[PDB]
Design a protein around this ligand. Structure first.
Ligand SMILES: CN(C)[C@@H]1C(O)=C(C(N)=O)C(=O)[C@@]2(O)C(O)=C3C(=O)c4c(O)ccc(Cl)c4[C@@](C)(O)[C@H]3C[C@@H]12
Ligand SMILES: CN(C)[C@@H]1C(O)=C(C(N)=O)C(=O)[C@@]2(O)C(O)=C3C(=O)c4c(O)ccc(Cl)c4[C@@](C)(O)[C@H]3C[C@@H]12
Ligand SMILES: [Cl-]
Ligand SMILES: [Cl-]
Ligand SMILES: [Cl-]
Ligand SMILES: [Cl-]
Ligand SMILES: [Cl-]
Ligand SMILES: [Cl-]
Ligand code: NI
Ligand code: NI
Lengths: 207, 207
């Protein structure tokens, strides 16, 4: 196989879809690529370095809404950015777990600087803007992680007795399982944005 | 060692603090307890069953604010409940990762039924109430997971060059690292609650 960076990342992503993050080993990546391990080591020093790389590439390839359009409202940008982030995390098995614990890579520096600058231009202090942005990121990841781990653990876990369930919980579980979490996610996103908006527009009023 | 359920859970929790969730094996739990594996197997069939159990016990022991006080506002309850959930998740190394993908256990059924009933009593439809509650849970877990995995991965990961950082990102990173994520978390929580409140009070107005 070719072993440029781009090839290795392709094979690692496919492998991730087949095995999830705990099955994503250096030994299995070597087998997928048709090489011995010492050969892989020249290219990929360890699991951490691979995962860091994957975290960036997943967004570089599938996170299309990383920047505000010309004249777009801050509220609209957060909306579009959260939905793009969610789609990119959901594209790969354990995608959100691959993101977790990263911080912006050099390759994302200008992107992430512009996001923060754009909030300050719309009235936010840096710290308030950052808190808004972070809250969107946290909420989005928590929702995707719950969905994805729920899915992967509902194989190991046997049944769920619809018999001794109390009535609202029974109904809540039907609701929750009726889609991919998308509606719950979108409803929450709107709440979060409006909340911010109240905060910003208050200024020094007690609110 | 004694091998009642409570003992096994104690030793598993200590082990979790020492090794994190990926180091929490059946073989190491046997060593900690001074027994052979076949002995442990009689008591604990697999890693999944152990983790499910841990997820419940962590909350049973440290999540004190699971129910509304007498006459407490819905907004106040969500606030107190989110802060209690966060504290309980943060008490153990990888605690939030141990929660992830679970769903309410029989032992929590009445607790979780009362939470949902209490929201419907305050004006929420069941589905709106559930969405609010879920958004709090998701946001809380995302914040705790980012904190905790950031911490555990900032050992494997070498430095972060304060040199070529753009100015707002440099400052945002100083801000973020200034505490445990608590302030960012609390600020976001308030936004989320106010958002809900706008939604509820709108009824059928366009809002
Ligand atoms: C999902 N969205 C809000 C953000 C986004 O669109 C990103 C992107 N590359 O386009 C991010 O890197 C983000 O998805 C992302 O991952 C960010 C993030 O990790 C982060 C951390 O950990 C620490 C400090 C900062 Cl300043 C950031 C931060 C704010 O830049 C966020 C940005 C989000
Ligand atoms: C953090 N807090 C909001 C909740 C809470 O206090 C719980 C608790 N046992 O006291 C939960 O189990 C929760 O922390 C928790 O874990 C819940 C949760 O997993 C969940 C899932 O997965 C599916 C359906 C339902 Cl109806 C629930 C659910 C709403 O009951 C939540 C409740 C939250
Ligand atoms: Cl080739
Ligand atoms: Cl090559
Ligand atoms: Cl500029
Ligand atoms: Cl003993
Ligand atoms: Cl015993
Ligand atoms: Cl009742
Ligand atoms: Ni991130
Ligand atoms: Ni849960």
């Amino acid at each position: 196989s070719r072993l440029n960076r781009e090839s290795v990342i392709d094979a690692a992503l496919e492998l991730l879809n087949e095995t999830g993050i705990d099955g994503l080993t250096t030994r299995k990546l070597a087998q997928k690529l048709g090489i011995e391990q010492p050969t892989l080591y020249w290219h990929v020093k360890n699991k951490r370095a691979l995962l860091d790389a994957l975290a960036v590439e997943i967004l570089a390839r599938h996170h299309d809404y990383s920047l505000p359009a010309a004249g777009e409202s801050w509220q609209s940008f957060l909306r579009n950015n959260a939905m793009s982030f969610r789609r990119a995390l959901l594209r790969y098995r354990d995608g959100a777990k691959v993101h977790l614990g990263t911080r912006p890579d050099e390759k994302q520096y200008d992107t992430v600087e512009t996001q923060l600058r754009f909030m300050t231009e719309n009235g936010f202090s840096l710290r308030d803007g950052l808190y808004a942005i972070s809250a969107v990121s946290h909420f989005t990841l928590g929702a995707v992680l719950e969905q994805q781990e729920h899915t992967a653990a509902l194989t190991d876990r046997p049944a769920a007795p619809d018999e001794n369930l109390p009535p609202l919980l029974r109904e809540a579980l039907q609701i929750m399982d009726s889609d991919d979490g998308e509606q719950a996610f979108l409803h929450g996103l709107e709440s979060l944005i409006r909340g911010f908006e109240v905060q910003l527009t208050a200024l020094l009023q007690i609110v």
